[PDB]
């Protein structure tokens, strides 16, 4: 099911969706299982009382947490491989950095290969440079366009002075190919 060799590394560095994806909880609280004809669902009720979270999964996948248990904010709900995007969105930048470094180092340590972590950290830093705009504001940035963090910060710094509304963005993780082709030098 899961990739195990060089394809695993290629998948990790391309920020692709893993094969054996294992959904992770979005909010801590209570968990219940809803069995359906030709489909299964996990419903999570947060202690805050906000909206429920529904994770649909297939019959084959083996559950990891029983019904009515207590789940943490970053707790897996199934056996598989966590995807970088969800962990980033739910636990910030440091969590995804640690996750990517550890996952990349496991593959190499399996075959007894030694590499320092600064080499991996350089690439991981190059993968987390740009931010995606979700609020238009009045900073001359359209929603949904990726901008390097430096440009976005200097734009907001100019706007905040002698201006009211900044622009708000969200961190974005992109693979090596998309990051390399989206450069400033044609």
**Taking the mean position of all CA atoms in its chain, how far away is CA 37?**
31
C-alpha–C-alpha distance, residues 78 and 59, integer Å:
12
Angstrom CA distances, 33 to 44, 75, 77, 81, 127, stand at 9, 16, 11, 21, 37
C-alpha–C-alpha distance, residues 128 and 168, integer Å:
17
Contact 3, 19 (CB under 8 A): yes
Q: How many CA atoms lie within 13 A of 70 on its CB side?
A: 1
| DSSP structure class, residue 21 | B
Q: How many CA atoms lie within 13 A of 43 on its CB side?
A: 9
**Lookup: tokens for 7:** 């394809």
Q: Which of 84, 167, 178 is nearest to 126 (CA)?
A: 178
For 185, the enclosing helix (H) or strand (E) is none
What was the resolution (in A) of this experimentally determined structure?
3.2
């Amino acid at each position: 099911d899961i990739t195990q060799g060089l394809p695993r590394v290629v998948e990790l560095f391309e920020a692709r969706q893993p094969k054996g994806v294992a959904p992770i909880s979005e909010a801590a609280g209570r968990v219940r299982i809803e069995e359906t004809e030709k489909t299964k669902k996990i419903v999570v009720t947060p202690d805050d009382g906000t909206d429920e979270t529904a994770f649909p999964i297939s019959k084959r996948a083996r559950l990891l947490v029983g019904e009515g248990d207590h789940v943490e904010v970053g707790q897996k709900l199934t056996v598989g491989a966590t995807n970088p995007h969800d962990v980033l969105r739910i636990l910030g930048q440091r969590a995804v950095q640690v996750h990517l470094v550890a996952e990349v180092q496991k593959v190499y340590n399996s075959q007894g290969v030694s590499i320092h972590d600064k080499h991996i950290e350089i690439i991981i830093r190059q993968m987390l440079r740009r931010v995606t705009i979700i609020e238009s504001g009045d900073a001359e940035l359209l929603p949904g366009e990726l901008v390097e963090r430096s440009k976005f910060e200097t734009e907001n710094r100019r706007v905040v002075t002698e201006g009211g509304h900044p622009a708000s963005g969200r961190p974005q993780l992109m693979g090596i190919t998309k990051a390399s082709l989206a450069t400033e030098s044609w």
